[PDB]
């Protein structure tokens, strides 16, 4: 309770507590001083002649004579329950809301515990987003990781809010009982400002979608350790609800860039060989530590699905953050910058984007038998449109031909009728119907990919 | 043996005071639980143990017991068709006994001590055996495991267990000195298994893909490397090699690759067919799994365990094909351990022995004639993943100058969805002039002359494509336009391949030869016709264009007749006009 | 012009990268020199 | 002897011993451990308290209780003889062969003793190679060191084998003893893999040049400090067999990059003020120490000439290894990847590869009275052709003057007939005839380098 006085050194964020051989490596302490204030700590690099502690907030107003750190528990953890399904938390997990604190059913550790590779299955179902480009050519499935490569002045939090406010798992298309699969959203944000905080609050409370959601918020004027801790809290709650109460969570992490900044700053204060342009060597290890927590286990019937929004620092796709993220996750959806100037929303260029676990979540008996064919055909057609567009814009439209005018008209009408969709909510039937209504602008027979059955049934 | 206590904990590295005699590079048991580590330094009477586990929660004062044996593996029957960890622990048993999460401290035997196999003696009493000889065989699924004598062991046998059924803990041969020969033996992983002499490879390693079996081939004793940026197809390419190569067994190592790939192979293979015998595909795979979230140093442990298993299966008389993954991730683990040791770095953090480590690992690979007299081979295909897609990282400049082929992937071809995106303008293969006898004997007789024609067509088409980009495909003469169009046919009809099809995922040598023949005939006759006077509009639009555009989707059971019909169709449709 | 700008950006990034390694080695050398001179009172 | 027990530190290469001051600086030791296996070492930085060793083989199994170190010799010295002119050694110098060691005739140090600048003479004799890009434009004389700046997948071993097979002096062109002089190779390899070693051995055994050459092998599955040791042994044997028995040796040093790597590794583990981009400060001193051992003396008649193969790492002439090597040696030959793409052989780029000791070994009375003039003119014309290449790439091939096309076609014919020569043994006169054939493709009077007399005599 009172134990472990007798510190010996303070400088910056560090603190050297003398003889203490009961503190275990990585434990949690609490530094109390001569005014009563209490802060946090973490015993890193224990030893025999002392034990180094790293303070959370700041070391202002700390003495060597009136100060004493004490043990809290063996490892880090948070108390999870089920009732927090309309709630709103903050960082370390303290309820900032208009309701009293919550009770626990059990308090789980907030780190590690990787899945056994022989104890999971393949992501097979699919999840509707209401956004045509995603649903038709990059169809998100249940149990994958799919980042959204934003920019510095592009609408990304708006797209995230839209996806969280529209998503649903269609239980009638491929086949199962309709009202048997629950749903949730474990939206976690870090480094936001007051404007974006208010935006998210209002947008979530308008349609009452908050009845099936939690919220972790980490406004950008809080100590950086909370910005480091938030994703682990969110993912712990997600794994709990999914693999123990059979929900189908959908985690959303905004601004992984602010997380990487916090990580570089908290690490670089221990002199540990900065790896590549600042950021330390183990940034891949950490990002992989928090990403791989999303999968689908056999025997159970839950799932976890991640959509980490991140903003390429200076439109570099060779920055360490986008590079490591692309190496870890599978498939990526990249926002565009030129489409945003022409006034299109949601601005998504389907040329540099793809999903790997795609052709397993569609096709025969999954959504509709023409899905892969229509995707391949729309891709090829838009590609040829861009090809002839570059050709013309280079030389001149004097000597075009018939097959080229068809494709230029297709490119224009596609870009203006299948990408631009405002705040509509297109089911996948309507998205495929628009796809066919745009394909029917091309002569039957020159669509060398789609088969002839669907050619005969539609178009 | 030597019992000590912990003195300091800092990340994955533990210092143990009171250790006088603790040899270097030995396996010790850290903590009150058992957290196998490896001594990598000695300072007075301590040791700088590096653990392989989470090491988060250990106190200061828990005992540390050494064992004196340097990280051995357990070679024996019952190894194929299974998963393993980096320290060779069966993930199947771990999951079955301790829930779906990977726990620490659990301890399971490498092999199985309850299954009994059909022993068959091949040694009489009073015989004279020495290291490497065989003692008898036991059967596995469609194979015949042999029972070697461990290297550097000799004597005179004195009794043999008669034929029957025994476990793996039964000493089946007793020498004269008193030692006991069981059905398995252990071998350290940081050594090489001795051989008689190292031959020179004169046989191709047929993988199935057209670029890598025609343009840049690899002899069946060689090495290779697949660098390239993220999202280009490296995983799909390596899995395609694993599921359609012409090796006896395959050992897939993965150190830093997402667990979804391991689960893909695990839940896909047991319903495929080995295209040499006819059994399930997973009966010739020993894949080793150590994903991203698992501990770190287990990465290098996994690399070495993989190479040692491949060396054993070579020593039995087969021809294996190791396929490592992310030697870059391995180098990252080395850098972490070094920076914990607190030593001075080299270019970009990595310690200044990366090159030596990589050189040893790649030099344990080649065709060899083992101690039993029979031949064997160990191919190696080591992926690399530079930090920005630029081939100048130390781990992709130290892995050159030690390999054979080199398969440079490319982000442009990868984003155009022109898959397998192997840049044919910046790759090379040094095994391309020692395979001409085998080609002339087993594929055709004018094969090496038909391949240079295609390579030259491409390397002269690029130069013209420059001016094509300059002034558009209008002012190019008939010659240059014909070159452009035949280059497009070559790219999008021969080099390209869709690995997710049913019949177009494995192109035999005869099929590749046929497609090359058809493209060359089309080129020659089109040049003749253009010289005679016809125009390009008349040249291109023949139906034979799309008749050869579908030439790769046909099956091997009928390709010869299709090819005959199509060559006669060229003969005809280029006769009228 | 954009190709030249990309080249410039790459060269500049490499040149700045190769200064932090120097600062790191210098700080380590200073630490070692302090650890040594803290024991050189006399002898 | 089993003295000097009580080591007190082991980490990687190094190894420390307690009080031992009778070990001389730079001595040689041998480290027996508790099972009999004996390793090797070398004393660095002796002192009154301790003494730092530098183990050769490795440090596996060495414990701190049962481990000793004994003195062998106060200085490194190799036991050389003349009986070692058909043999094959490894690293330190044990015989990797089926024959017992040699009975020495004299044991000299391996470290140094440079040549006195007044006991030398200018290398003058002329040795042709049959490679018309080295016989005519980058002459190689007997007594000069001349590297080969290779690349990753470029043929350098083949060129080295071809030079070693074809090289012969031309005594009947300046007046000397007609038939007296074969060669004597001292091939020394440090780091070669198995494929390259097998190629070299096959080739040497095909021509019968194996019973007059010594071999030091340090293949890639061996330690690195042995790589640090090998070339000094090689050059010791060469200097012996030259300045004592009137031979003419030709030392082929392979892959100096691996030697520089071992050097950088020991320097790093020693913490010795990295000079430039890794590699330590004294690397110029070390490379000079092992390069300057090749000259010719007066009074004697032996000679030592070198060809250090080295692979510039990333194709940068500004990398420290090629940079210091170029500053130390006198001449260089540089391959070209662009020429290797187009099937040329040998792909020797003729512009950036010069030789300094050429104006003294060629000219009137030695080869022919018009050699250096054809050299100068060929260089000028090829530079003009290369510049007109870029002029084309800017403008277009049809907007060219009438003589710019002449220069362009000269450049292409030069790259197609003068450089590309297969595996054939040319002669100085055949190559000069080809050079004059090419130089006649340009008009007269536009060659301001040759004299009018030669211009009239040859055309």
Residue D124 has which token pair? Answer: 């003058």
Test the C interface: residue of B338, B342, B345 with most C CBs within 10 Å:
B345
Q: Do D224 and B359 contact (CB within 8 A), yes or no?
A: no
Q: Say if residues D172 and D178 touch (Cβ distance below 8 Å).
A: yes
Interface of B with C in 171-190 (CB under 8 A): none
Residue D4, CA atoms < 13 Å, CB-side half-sphere: 23
**3-state SS string over B383-447?**
ECCCCCCCCCCHHHHCCCCCCCCECCECHHHHHCCCCCCECCCCCECCCCCCCHHHHHHHCCCCH
Question: Cα separation of B110 and B84, whole Å?
Answer: 9
Q: Give the DSSP letter string of B5-36.
A: EEEEEETTEEEEES-SS--SS-EEEETTTT--
Element counts in chain C: helices (H) and strands (E) = 1, 0
Count of other CB atoms within 10 angstroms of residue D228 = 23
CA distance A416 to A339: 10
Binding region of B for ATP: 228-235
Method: cryo-EM
In whole angstroms, give the CA distance from residue C38 to residue C31: 11
Q: How many CB atoms lie within 10 A of CB A403?
A: 12
CB B7 within 8 Å of CB B74: no
**Sign, Cα dihedral of A103, A109, A111, A116:** negative
Nearest to D220 among B347, B359, B404 (CB): B359
The verdict on C25 touching D (C-beta cutoff 8 Å) is yes
Contact list in A for residue C24 (CB cut-off 8 A) is: 273-274
A65 at the C interface (CB within 8 A)? Answer: no
Task: Name D125's Cβ contacts closer than 8 Å, sequence gap at least 6.
Answer: D141, D142, D143, D169, D361
Within 13 Å, how many C-alpha atoms sit on residue A266's CB side?
Answer: 23
Enumerate residues 6+ apart whose C-beta is below 8 A from A363: A369, A371, A372
Q: In 3D, which of D228, D231, D221 has the Cα closest to residue D252?
A: D231
CB–CB contacts below 8 A, C to D: 4
User: Is the N-terminal amide bond of B55 cis, ω within 30° of 0?
Assistant: no
Closest CA to D196 of D234, D150, D230, D238: D150
CA pair distance D302, A216, nearest whole angstrom: 84
**Are the beta carbons of A80 and A104 closer than 8 angstroms?**
yes
> What order of strands is seen across the sheet that includes strand A51-54?
A7-11, A14-17, A51-54, A41-46, A28-33, A67-73
Domain ranges within chain B, ordered by starting residue:
1-71, 72-114+182-429, 115-181, 430-577
Which of C 2-21 lie inside 8 A of D, CB atoms? 18
* CA–CA separation, D20 and D6 (whole Å): 10
Q: Which of B33, B55, B108, B387 to mutate to test the interface with A (most CBs of A within 10 A)?
A: B387
CA nearest neighbour of A231 among A188, A279, A264, A200 = A188
Beta strands in D282-372 (DSSP E): 303-306, 309-311, 333-334
The H or E element spanning position A11 is strand A7-11
- Terminal Cα-to-Cα distance of chain D (whole angstroms): 78
In angstroms, the Cα distances linking D2 to B485, D10, D24 are 80, 19, 17
**B100, B349, B415 ranked by CB distance to A273: nearest:** B349
Return phi, psi of residue B161, to 5°: -65, 130
The region that residue B261 occupies, defined by phi over 0 for left and psi between -120 and 50 for alpha, beta otherwise, is: alpha
User: Position of tokens 């208010």?
Assistant: A198
CA distance B78 to B554: 40
Q: Which DSSP letter does residue A128 get?
A: B
Cα–Cα distance for residue pair B486/B507, rounded to 1 Å: 21
* Beta carbons within 8 Å of A418's beta carbon, 6+ residues apart: A132, A133, A378, A434, A435, A438
Quote the CA–CA distance of B293 and B288 in Å, as a whole number. 15
List b or e across B1-23, with b for residues whose CB sees 16 or more CB atoms inside 10 angstroms. Answer: ebebebbbbbbbbbbbebbeebb
Contact A274 C20 (CB under 8 A): yes
Contact B29, B63 (CB under 8 A): no
Q: Give the number of other CB atoms < 10 A from CB of residue A45.
A: 18
CB atoms within 10 A of CB A361: 23
Q: What is the CB neighbour count within 10 angstroms for residue B99?
A: 12
Burial (CB count within 10 angstroms: exposed 0-12, middle 13-18, buried 19+), residue B491: middle
Contact D273, D280 (CB under 8 A): yes
Query: Which residue in B129, B186, B139 sits closest to B160, CA to CA?
Result: B129
* Both structure tokens of B296: 């770190």
Helices (H) and strands (E) in chain A, counts: 12, 11
Task: Write phi, then psi, for B389 (nearest 5 degrees).
Answer: 80, 10
Whether the Cβ atoms of residue D74 and residue D104 lie closer than 8 Å to each other: no
Degrees to nearest 5, angle at CA B68 with B62 and B73:
105
Determine contact, residues A224/A258, Cβ cutoff 8 Å: no
Q: How many CA atoms lie within 13 A of D187 on its CB side?
A: 25
Angle at B486 between CA B481 and CA B490, to 5 degrees: 150
Q: How crowded is the C-beta side of B394, counted as CA atoms within 13 Å? A: 22
User: Is B341 within 8 Å of B40 (Cβ atoms)?
Assistant: yes
Contacts of B263 (CB under 8 A, 6+ apart): A117, A118, A120, A121, A122
For residues A338 and A154, is the Cβ–Cβ distance under 8 A?
no
Contact of chains D and B by CB distance (3 or more pairs under 8 angstroms): yes
Closest CA to D224 of B353, B363, B395: B353
Q: Is B41 on the interface with D (CB under 8 A)?
A: yes
Ramachandran bin of D392, using left for φ above 0, alpha for ψ from -120 to 50, beta for the remaining angles: alpha
Alpha carbon distance D382, D405 (integer Å): 13
Q: Do residue C21 and residue B345 have CB atoms under 8 angstroms apart?
A: yes
Q: Mention every residue, 6+ apart, whose C-beta is less than 8 A from residue A98.
A: none
State both tokens at A363.
Answer: 């096709």
**Chain B residues within an 8 Å CB radius of D313:** 397
- The resolution of the experimental structure, rounded to one decimal in Å, is 3.5
| CA atoms of D263 and D245, how far apart (whole Å) | 33
* Closest among B73, B64, B72, B74 to B28, alpha carbons compared: B64
Q: Tokens 């049934």 identify what position?
A: A457
D458 touches D373 (CB < 8 A): no
Burial group, residue B85, by CB count within 10 angstroms (0-12, 13-18, 19+): buried
Residues of D with CB under 8 A from a CB of B: 8-12, 59-66, 152-153, 191, 193-195, 198, 219-221, 224, 257, 261, 264-265, 268-269, 271, 277-278, 311, 313-314, 341-342
Q: Which two tokens stand for residue D347?
A: 């792909």
Q: Which two tokens stand for residue B42?
A: 């000695």
Instruction: Measure the CA–CA gap between A261 and A311, rounded to whole angstroms.
Output: 12
Full strand arrangement of the beta sheet holding A333-334: A309-311, A148-150, A333-334
Pull the structure tokens for residue D365. 């009375």
How many angstroms separate the CA atoms of B472 and D152, rounded?
Answer: 37
* Structure-block tokens of residue D397: 């091939």
Residue A53, beta-bridge partner list: A15, A43
Distance, in Å, from the CA atom of A88 to the CA atom of D313, rounded to the nearest integer, reads 57
H or E element, residue B51: strand B46-51
Give the pairing type, strands D44-46 and D51-54.
antiparallel
Report how far residue B58's alpha carbon sits from residue A22's, in angstroms, rounded to the nearest whole number. 10
Tell me if residue D110 falls in helix, strand or coil. coil
A277–C24 CB contact, under 8 Å: no
Q: How far apart are CA B547 and CA B551, in angstroms?
A: 7
Q: What's the length of chain B?
A: 577
Output the six-digit token pair for D29: 């030791």
Partners of residue B289 in chain A, C-beta under 8 Å: 117
> β-strand B225-226 against D70-73: which pairing, if any?
unpaired
- DSSP secondary structure string, D241-296? HHHTT--EEEE-EE-HHHHHHHHHHHHHHHT----SSSS-TTHHHHHHHHHSS---
Angle at D4 (CA atoms; ends D2, D8), nearest 5 degrees: 130
**φ, ψ at B142 (rounded to 5°):** 80, 5
Residue C8 Cα, gap to closest chain D Cα (Å)? 18
Interatomic CA distance for residues D121 and D299, integer angstroms: 9
- Per DSSP bridges, beta strands D248-251 and D303-306 are parallel
Separation between Cα atoms, residue A217 and residue A234, nearest integer Å: 10
CA distance D285 to chain C (A): 23
Q: D-chain residues within 8 Å CB-CB of B359?
A: 191, 193, 220-221
The 3-state DSSP class for residue B571 equals: helix
CB burial of A114-133 (b: ≥16 within 10 Å; e: otherwise) equals bbbbbbbebbebbbbbbbbb
Structure tokens that stand for B242 in this block: 């694993």
- Give burial (CB, 10 Å; 0-12/13-18/19+) of A208: exposed
Q: Which residues of B are annotated as a binding site?
A: 228-235
Helical (H) or strand (E) element with D11: strand D7-11
Task: Check if the beta carbon of residue D72 is closer than 8 Å to that of residue D206.
Answer: no
Structure tokens at B103: 């726990």
For A436, the token pair is 């066919």
Omega before residue D45 within 30° of 0, cis: no
**Helix, strand, or coil (residue B347):** helix
Tell me if A146 sits within 8 A of A333, measured CB to CB. yes
Distance CA C13, CA B85 (A): 39
* CA atoms B386, B387, B392, B394: torsion sign: negative
Which of A239, A193, A241, A238 has the alpha carbon at shortest distance from A217? A193
């Amino acid at each position: 309770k009172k134990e472990y006085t007798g510190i010996t050194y303070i400088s910056g964020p560090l603190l050297f507590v003398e003889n203490a051989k009961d503190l275990a490596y990585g434990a949690i302490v609490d530094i109390k001083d001569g005014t009563g204030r209490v802060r946090g700590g973490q015993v890193i690099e224990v030893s025999e002649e002392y034990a180094v502690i790293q303070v959370f907030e700041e070391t202002t107003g700390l003495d060597l004579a009136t100060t004493s750190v004490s043990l809290v528990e063996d490892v880090a953890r948070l108390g999870v329950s089920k009732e927090m399904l309309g709630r709103r938390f903050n960082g370390i997990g303290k309820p900032i809301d208009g309701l009293p604190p919550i009770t626990p059913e059990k308090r789980l550790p907030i780190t590690g515990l990787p899945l056994n590779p022989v104890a999971r299955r393949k992501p097979e179902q699919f999840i509707q987003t209401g956004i045509s480009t995603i649903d038709v050519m990059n169809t998100l499935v249940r149990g994958q990781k799919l980042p959204i490569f934003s920019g510095s002045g592009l609408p990304a939090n708006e797209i995230a809010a839209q996806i969280a406010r529209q998503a649903t798992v269609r239980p009638d298309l491929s086949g199962e009982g309709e009202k048997e699969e629950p749903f949730a959203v474990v939206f976690a944000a870090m480094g936001i400002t007051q404007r974006e905080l208010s935006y998210f609050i209002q947008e979530f409370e308008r349609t009452g979608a908050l009845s099936r959601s939690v919220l972790f918020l980490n406004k950008a004027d809080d100590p950086t350790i909370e910005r480091i801790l938030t994703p682990r809290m969110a993912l712990t709650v997600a794994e709990y609800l999914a693999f123990e109460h059979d929900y189908h969570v959908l985690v959303i992490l905004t601004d992984m860039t602010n997380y990487c900044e916090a990580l570089r700053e908290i690490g670089a204060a221990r002199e540990e060989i900065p790896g590549r342009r600042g950021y330390p060597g183990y940034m891949y290890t950490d990002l992989a530590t928090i990403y791989e927590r999303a999968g689908v286990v056999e025997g159970k019937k839950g799932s976890v699905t991640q959509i980490p929004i991140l903003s390429m620092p200076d439109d570099d796709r060779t920055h360490p953050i986008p590079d490591l993220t692309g190496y870890i996750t599978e498939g990526q959806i990249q926002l565009s910058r030129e489409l945003h100037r022409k006034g299109i929303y949601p601005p998504i260029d389907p040329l540099p984007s793809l999903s790997r676990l795609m052709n397993n979540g569609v096709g025969k008996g999954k959504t509709r038998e023409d899905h892969k064919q229509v995707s391949d055909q729309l891709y090829s057609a838009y590609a040829n449109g861009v090809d002839i567009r570059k050709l013309v814009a280079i030389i001149g439209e004097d000597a075009l031909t018939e097959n080229d005018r068809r494709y230029l008209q297709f490119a224009d009408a596609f870009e203006r009728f299948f990408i631009n969709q405002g705040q509509q909510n297109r089911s996948i039937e309507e998205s495929l119907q628009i796809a066919w209504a745009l394909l029917s602008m091309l002569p039957q027979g020159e669509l060398k990919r789609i088969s002839k059955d669907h050619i005969g049934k539609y178009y | 043996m030597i019992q000590g206590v912990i003195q300091k904990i800092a990340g994955p590295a533990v210092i143990a005071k009171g250790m006088l005699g603790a040899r270097m590079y030995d396996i010790c048991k850290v903590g009150e639980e058992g957290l196998v580590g490896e001594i990598i330094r000695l300072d007075g009477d301590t040791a700088f143990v590096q653990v392989y586990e989470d090491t988060s929660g250990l106190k200061v004062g828990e005992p540390v017991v050494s064992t004196g044996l340097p990280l051995a593996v357990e070679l024996g029957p019952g190894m194929l068709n299974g998963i393993y960890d980096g320290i060779q622990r069966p993930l199947e048993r771990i999951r079955e006994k301790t829930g779906i999460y990977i726990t620490r401290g659990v301890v399971v035997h490498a092999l199985d001590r309850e299954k009994k196999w059909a022993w068959t003696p091949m040694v009489k009493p009073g015989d004279e055996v020495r290291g490497g000889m065989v003692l008898g065989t036991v059967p596995e699924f469609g194979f015949t495991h042999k029972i070697l004598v461990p290297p550097d062991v000799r004597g005179r046998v004195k009794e043999v267990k008669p034929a029957g059924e025994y476990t793996v803990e039964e000493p089946v041969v007793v020498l004269e000195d008193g030692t006991e020969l069981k059905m398995y033996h252990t071998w350290p992983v940081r050594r090489a298994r001795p051989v008689q002499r190292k031959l020179d490879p004169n046989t191709p390693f047929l993988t199935g893909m057209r670029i890598l079996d025609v343009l840049f081939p690899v002899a069946m004793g060689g090495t290779a490397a697949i660098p390239g940026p993220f999202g280009s197809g490296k995983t799909v390419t390596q899995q395609s090699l694993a599921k359609w190569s012409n090796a006896d067994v395959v050992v897939y190592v993965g150190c830093g690759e997402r667990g979804n790939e391991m689960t893909d192979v695990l839940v896909e293979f047991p319903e495929l067919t080995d295209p040499k015998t006819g059994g399930p595909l997973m009966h010739r795979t020993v894949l080793i799994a150590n994903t991203s979230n698992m501990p770190v140093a287990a990465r290098e442990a996994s690399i070495y365990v993989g190479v040692t298993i491949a060396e054993y299966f070579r020593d039995q008389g087969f021809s294996v094909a190791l396929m490592a993954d992310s030697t870059s991730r391995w180098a990252e683990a080395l850098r972490e351990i070094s920076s914990r040791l607190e030593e001075m770095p080299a270019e970009e953090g990595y310690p200044p022995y990366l090159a030596a480590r990589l050189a040893a690992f790649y030099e344990r690979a080649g065709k060899v004639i083992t101690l039993g007299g029979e031949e064997g081979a160990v191919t190696i295909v080591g992926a690399v993943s530079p930090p920005g897609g630029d081939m100048s990282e130390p781990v992709t400049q130290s892995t050159l100058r030690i390999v054979g082929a080199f398969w440079r992937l490319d982000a442009s071809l990868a984003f155009r969805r022109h898959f397998p995106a192997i840049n044919w303008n910046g790759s090379y293969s040094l095994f391309t002039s020692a395979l001409d006898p085998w080609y002339r004997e087993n594929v055709a007789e004018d094969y090496p002359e038909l391949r240079d024609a295609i390579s030259e067509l491409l390397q002269r088409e690029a130069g013209l494509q420059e001016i094509v980009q300059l002034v558009g495909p209008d002012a190019l003469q008939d010659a240059e336009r014909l070159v452009i169009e035949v280059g497009r046919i070559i790219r999008e009809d021969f080099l390209q391949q869709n690995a997710y099809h049913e019949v177009d995922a494995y192109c035999s040598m005869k099929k590749a030869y046929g497609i090359m023949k058809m493209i060359l005939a089309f080129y020659k006759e089109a040049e003749a016709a253009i010289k005679r006077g016809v125009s390009i509009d008349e040249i291109l639009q023949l139906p034979v264009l799309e008749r050869i555009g579908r030439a790769r989707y046909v099956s091997e059971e009928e390709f010869p007749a299709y090819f005959e019909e199509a060559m006669k169709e060229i003969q005809g449709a280029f006769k009228a006009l | 012009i954009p190709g030249i700008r990309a080249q410039i950006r790459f060269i500049q990034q490499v040149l700045e990268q190769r200064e932090r390694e120097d600062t790191f080695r210098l700080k380590r050398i200073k630490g070692k020199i302090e650890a040594r001179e803290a024991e050189e009172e006399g002898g």
